[PDB]
Write a protein that binds this ligand. Structure first.
Ligand SMILES: OC[C@H]1O[C@@H](O[C@H]2[C@H](O)[C@@H](O)[C@H](O[C@H]3[C@H](O)[C@@H](O)[C@H](O[C@H]4[C@H](O)[C@@H](O)[C@H](O)O[C@@H]4CO)O[C@@H]3CO)O[C@@H]2CO)[C@H](O)[C@@H](O)[C@@H]1O
Length: 512
């Protein structure tokens, strides 16, 4: 099996995150135990492969044999079979065991490695006779051991798998370096002597963009795009063109919410993975992309981008993706720029009704610049929010959808809060009427000094981090308890919104 064969068979992939990998068991985190029909839903979307992370920890019995709980093994087989019966290529692994107990390798190798061997022999034996579309991944983000120990661990677990024989003699086995890190793979890793292995790494760069840390709310400079390619090209050069298939076991955004950047990031990364013959598997923890309960994608466009790009089909990208019009403003013609990426604009629709080229909109000769006429905009537009959506269709690749959003100045019922340090318990709710605007990022500054509220954590910036420090929910703004606990004296928080330049300033007073 060549790297090209694996790409053709597996790209694009999707992770069943925070499910069988949850702790202590399936359903312990934000997703319930997976329903069979979720795999039908992922099939409907067009993914060719799924990764099923599994944390075995609480289901492993005592020394010396470490028997895996029978009901758990039955459940993992049930879920694995559901995926396989939908003709997916399927990745089965050992997941959060990596830090729950495997990272004891450094301090206690002989006991830990013995235990891991007995665990993998049990997994290998149960799944020995499954079709070749099932792949084994030795361990997720391995840590707490040397590079030498990592290479030993890969070799020993692979030997155990091979030794069970039958189809496990030829089954694809996925290995990587420390922490599934790309640089470890390139510099400390050595491939086991085996001609049926696949190499892996995870990719989440830039971390502060994908996680919306420190106010890094956009992505896509020429340098950023160049740096993304230069990141992964050496893996192609050292391994792929030497015949090693490669799986990017996880990639994707982790809270970043700006549409244009998110779409551009996914199209760019997946196209680069495809170019260099690496299978991209999308990280979905159940909150960020596919809504399993509603059985719908929270961002259908970014999903369609991954589906097309993962098949080697470039997607056109429009800017802006969100058009903000302020209540009362004078209306003029609106320019939308299109990064065609080889594609051809075939129309612009509202619902399934087409706009008229000439009177509703015009295009330049290149076909990459669209002017939506003011009179058309006026018709599409008194309550704030998304008033209309324009769907740009292309001959090939995903459609682009532009929200036309009416907004007005956000209003807060209360913009000053007093907190007692001894009485802190849970997040601070800041009721708001955002009037069509959306939360982008937040910074926090100590009034008397002008220094960051979180200076003891991040010295160089006042900007806070999405989710761990702040969030928006049901139209209200929140500061996490974490932030409140760092407050020493009166501070000012700036909630920066979309559209760029609109913000809401909140003062927080501190008492004992
Ligand atoms: O625990 C009860 C409580 O759980 C809540 O669910 C939380 C979990 O508590 C929390 O541990 C979990 O954090 C996940 C995160 O969502 C994943 O995106 C992340 O994925 C990792 C991946 O596993 C690694 O292989 C990879 O390389 O890095 C990515 C990204 O970091 O893994 C972490 C766990 O380590 O998130 C859950 C949802 O917020 C419930 O919501 C709550 O109701 C429960 O009371």
């Amino acid at each position: 099996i060549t790297p090209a064969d694996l790409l053709e068979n597996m790209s694009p992939g999707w992770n069943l995150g925070n499910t069988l990998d949850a702790v202590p068991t399936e359903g312990s985190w934000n997703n319930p135990p997976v329903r069979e029909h979720t795999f039908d839903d992922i099939r409907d979307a067009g993914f060719k492969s799924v990764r099923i992370p599994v944390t075995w920890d609480s289901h492993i019995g005592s020394a010396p044999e470490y028997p895996i709980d029978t009901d758990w093994m039955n459940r993992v087989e049930e879920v694995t079979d559901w995926a396989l019966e939908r003709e997916f290529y399927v990745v089965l692994n050992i997941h959060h065991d990596s830090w729950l107990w495997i990272s004891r390798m450094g301090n206690s190798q002989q006991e830990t490695l013995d235990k891991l061997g007995k665990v993998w022999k049990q997994i290998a034996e149960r799944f020995k006779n499954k079709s070749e579309r099932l792949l084994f991944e030795i361990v997720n983000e391995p840590t707490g051991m040397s590079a030498y120990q990592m290479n030993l661990l890969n070799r020993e677990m692979l030997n155990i798998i091979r030794s069970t024989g039958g189809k496990n003699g030829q089954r694809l086995v996925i290995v990587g370096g420390l922490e599934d890190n790309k640089d470890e793979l390139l510099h400390s890793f050595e491939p086991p002597d085996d001609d049926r292995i696949v190499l892996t790494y995870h990719y989440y760069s830039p971390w502060d963009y994908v996680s919306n840390w420190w106010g890094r709310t956009t992505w896509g400079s020429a340098a950023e795009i160049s740096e993304m390619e230069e990141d992964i090209k050496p893996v192609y050069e050292k391994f792929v063109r030497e015949g090693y298939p490669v799986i990017i076991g996880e990639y994707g955004t982790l809270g970043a919410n700006e549409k244009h950047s998110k779409w551009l990031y996914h199209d760019t990364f997946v196209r680069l993975a495809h170019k260099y013959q690496m299978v991209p598997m999308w990280w979905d923890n159940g909150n960020d992309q596919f809504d399993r309960a509603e059985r719908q994608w929270r961002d259908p466009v970014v999903k369609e981008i991954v589906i097309q790009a993962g098949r080697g089909v470039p997607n056109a990208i429009i800017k802006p993706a969100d058009l903000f019009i302020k209540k009362g403003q004078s209306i003029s013609d609106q320019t939308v720029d299109i990064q065609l990426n080889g594609n051809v604009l075939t129309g612009i629709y509202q619902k399934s009704e087409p706009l008229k080229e000439g009177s509703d909109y015009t295009v330049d000769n290149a076909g990459k610049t669209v002017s939506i006429k003011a009179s058309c905009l006026a018709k599409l537009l008194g309550q704030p929010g998304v008033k209309a959506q324009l769907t740009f269709t292309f001959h090939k690749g995903a459609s682009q959808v532009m929200d036309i959003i009416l907004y007005d100045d956000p209003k807060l019922e209360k913009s000053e809060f007093t907190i007692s340090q001894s009485a802190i318990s849970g997040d601070l709710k800041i009721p708001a009427s955002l009037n069509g605007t959306k939360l982008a990022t937040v910074k926090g500054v100590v009034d008397s000094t002008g220094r960051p509220v979180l200076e003891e954590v991040w010295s160089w910036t006042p900007y806070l981090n999405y989710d761990e420090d702040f969030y928006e929910k049901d139209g209200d703004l929140y500061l996490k308890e974490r932030v409140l606990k760092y407050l020493k004296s009166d501070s000012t928080f700036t909630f920066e919104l979309w559209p760029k330049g609109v913000e809401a300033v909140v003062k927080v007073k501190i008492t004992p």
